[PDB]
Amino acid sequence: QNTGGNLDPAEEIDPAVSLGQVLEKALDLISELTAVADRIWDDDGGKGYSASLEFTIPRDSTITNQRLDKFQP
């Protein structure tokens, strides 16, 4: 869900280094981001049809070139 701004919606961490590493590469990109996120969940792309998540607990934002002029993540 999105309220204000251009925000695009076990063990948890915040590996922001992968962001810079991907930005360093020549931006397939979605597939690599999905693989990195799986190694480290779902994303939203529209209002009213946000992608749902399936979870199973048996034991106890994203990156986009939202501008259409020049493709820059």
Partner: protein
Amino acid sequence: TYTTGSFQSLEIKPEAHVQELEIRLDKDTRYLTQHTRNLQPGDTFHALVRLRLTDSGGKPLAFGLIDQPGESVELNYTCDQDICELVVHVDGTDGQKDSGEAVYRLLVGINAPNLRESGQTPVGSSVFLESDLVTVGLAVDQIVGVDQRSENFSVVGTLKLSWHDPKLGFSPDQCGCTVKSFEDASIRAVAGEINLPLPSFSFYNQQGNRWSQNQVIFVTPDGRASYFERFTVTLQAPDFDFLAYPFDRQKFSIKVDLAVPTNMFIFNEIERFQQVVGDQLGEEEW
């Protein structure tokens, strides 16, 4: 006439929507962007001839896989999102170069270009969401004034825009009258009234507010709307050069710009609905 619109899943192979075109690259338009219409849940977009495919919001959706046979890059994507819009963007300038000319052709299909296998493809339907086609006609009745110290000229004339917008269509019975007319309100004001896109225009040089008379924008149920306005407008004329007065020849340039980009509306055809310059009694100054 056969009616189309909105009211209150078989044999999809024959209704293949696949069409192609050739493009020219030069000057600033090195980067090219194209849209597409809403698609069925099962439709898969195949792009053939870098290039990338995103949605209307710019969120990346697919890239192109480079297959050496056939040159260029081959791109393919599929989704089941129902009401959504997709965009394909191609960049031809990955590095600084002299360039100056580029010829390029593309292959585009919304379900299956493989079935059509390119070719002439007569039954293909264009899916680029092409810009609406608005014809424009202008006539000059008088040049009422020329203020040559301020370098402006006040001119009276008639203007007539005419464009086909199927989304603007309606059922004639709901209001009784066949033609739905919005009187004495500018195209921008009408677009404010009804939340729809319209080809708002401007004179690009007028100083002060022009006098709009008899202006009316009326729509036909088929969707072919037309706007008419008898204006008395004071244009600015920088091109005036009175260094050779009185033996000078001047250019009265009346420029009707569209307040919407070429993606939305473009002036297709000039309409000679009336004599471009009117003949009136008297010698007249100009």
